[PDB]
Amino acid sequence: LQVRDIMVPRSQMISIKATQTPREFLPAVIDAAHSRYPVIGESHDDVLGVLLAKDLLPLILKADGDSDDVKKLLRPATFVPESKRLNVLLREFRANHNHMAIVIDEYGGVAGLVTIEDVLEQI
């Protein structure tokens, strides 16, 4: 199997727009209750990095944390091609201690996202 077969497709990704402050994005984030979210720029094809929910914790004890710039909290996205084999990806997740990869198509567009939990249900 390949990543493209088991990915969360681009339309179904819950993403955070990089222009939004926590005041604006947190309601949808809290509703979705995911651990990690792609952060986008101009479009769903413009993935800037990934936001970990737990990385928002420092904002609780700030004066004005609800107005912070999310770009500063970003981790780089791990990118994989659509054709990446699942057995290879699983070994990569172990080596790099990550949970999420952003899937890019043959044109560099964003196909979707894929997680370690999803890989385990398929191989």
Ligand X SMILES: Nc1ncnc2c1ncn2[C@@H]1O[C@H](COP(=O)(O)O)[C@@H](O)[C@H]1O
- Min dist. Cβ of residue 34 to ligand X (A): 4
Q: DSSP character for 67?
A: G
Selected binder of ligand X within 9, 117, 122, 123 (CB under 6 A): 117
- Annotated binding-site residue? 116: no
91 binds a second copy (CB under 8 A): yes
Among 36, 49, 77, 101, binds ligand X (CB under 6 A): 36
Q: Of 46 and 92, which has the nearer Cβ to a second copy?
A: 92
Distance CA 123, CA 30 (A): 31
Q: Please check whether residue 35 is in contact with residue 50, taking contact to mean a CB–CB distance below 8 angstroms.
A: no
Quote the CA–CA distance of 60 and 37 in Å, as a whole number: 19
- Residue 55 binds to ligand X (criterion: CB under 6 A): no
**In whole angstroms, how far apart are CA 8 and each of 17, 20, 57, 76, 100?**
18, 23, 27, 19, 11
Residues that constitute the known binding site: 14, 34-36, 115, 118
Binding site for AMP: residue ranges? 14, 34-36, 115, 118
